[PDB]
Design a protein around this ligand. Structure first.
Ligand SMILES: CCCCCCCCCCCC(=O)OC[C@H](COP(=O)([O-])O)OC(=O)CCCCCCCCCCC
Lengths: 73, 160, 157, 73
């Protein structure tokens, strides 16, 4: 099986965002070849799917806050 | 509050590229049945050039009844996993702790990945820190009572 | 652990020391229900060795037994005293070292008091939650690490 | 009002022993005039009474153990 998103309705748009990333990670970002997010599409799909579901999630406020902190002081 | 640091090291027989990737795609796997979902909340490349990534994960667990009554109905935690990847010096930092339940306790996990130019290895440095929802108060409050209750008992008994 | 208090009795040694042996009953310790002398003797050094048993009330269970032990040195005007609850030590053990020593230049009896509190059942805890973390830590660091190994291996096949 | 013994039936035996001791302690022992039990009769009558009452006290084992210890090391 693959990695589930917390929103079962995004598990897929997720998988794809992931795939193009691994490609852009290993083959481009890691080798200095990076250039203009070769995945606007896949990300946006997934990232807007997950954001929709997140607002209904009580954990969101806690997550936002945690995103403000810098654990790497 | 109360804190308990724990360090431990591990060396991987592969490069930073090989290991880092596995980090990002570590789920699912033989010993992660408790990991339910992982999402990539936000990713990007800073002014510095490193990959900045925040991922929300949700792991499950089975509380020990004989010490679980008090706590309501809870079989799972939300966790945040922030990370940084420096493509230059081939190193990646990975902070990661719980988001909900910080009330009872709060676990934190700093793990770093350094590639050892020489040994073709990627060294991983894990530091885990437990703390507590609680504890700030009493004992200290109390102590002092024991301090004065005796600061009084000695002086009180003295007179007699 | 500790409690360092000092007091001075503008009295001589024979007075302060006799008092200690006859401190009960008195209005400041109504909680002291009884005191008994279990053993008393003069060792080969000429010092009066005593060990007494007191029962103290306070707030089924309710009371505590305290052991008292003392040594009186008539040669140098010194008196060493020790007290510690006999029961309930698992919960909290309270130890008291108070020495009375006569000072000639001021004609007063100085009392030095040290009080140690020590709980074993407490510390037993401090130790389990400690082991619990080392365990939960150790176990999981092993797993996660082998998760990464698998994930890495297959990703190479 | 004299201090009682944990065992009511010995309070009087203790009163008599203590009185004897106080005199022996203040007039003899502290003045380097005696190192012997000049209160033997009162002490033995009293201590026989107490030990008899201690055999029936749950705290005996603890007491026995504490008597072997040397706090002043
Ligand atoms: C009062 C209860 C509070 C529980 C709070 C738990 C907070 C954990 C925060 C830190 C989690 C983390 O980043 O640790 C990394 C490891 C990674 O191991 P794995 O998940 O890859 O096998 O993750 C783990 O293996 C550790 C967590 C595994 C157990 C998760 C239990 C979730 C809570 C269940 C009770 C509500």
């Amino acid at each position: 099986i693959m990695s589930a998103s917390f929103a079962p309705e995004c598990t897929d748009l997720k998988t794809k965002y992931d795939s193009c990333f691994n490609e852009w990670y290993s083959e481009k970002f890691l080798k200095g070849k990076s250039v203009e997010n070769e995945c606007s599409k896949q990300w946006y799909a997934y990232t807007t799917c997950v954001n929709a579901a997140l607002v209904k999630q009580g954990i969101k406020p806690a997550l936002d806050e945690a995103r403000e902190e810098a654990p790497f002081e | 509050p109360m804190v308990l640091l724990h360090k431990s090291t591990h060396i991987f027989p592969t490069d930073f590229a090989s290991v880092s990737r596995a980090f990002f795609n570590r789920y699912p796997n033989p010993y992660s049945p408790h990991v339910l979902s992982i999402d990539t909340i936000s990713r990007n490349v800073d002014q510095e050039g490193n990959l900045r990534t925040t991922r929300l994960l949700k792991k499950s667990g089975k509380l020990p009844t004989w010490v679980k009554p008090f706590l309501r109905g809870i079989t799972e935690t939300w966790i945040i996993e922030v990370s940084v990847v420096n493509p230059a010096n081939s190193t990646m930092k990975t902070y990661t702790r719980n988001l909900d339940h910080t009330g009872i306790m709060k676990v934190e996990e700093y793990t770093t990945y350094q590639f050892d130019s020489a040994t073709s290895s990627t060294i991983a440095d894990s530091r885990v820190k437990f703390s507590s929802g609680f504890n700030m108060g009493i004992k200290s409050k109390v102590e002092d009572w024991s301090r004065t209750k005796f600061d009084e008992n000695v002086k009180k008994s003295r007179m007699g």
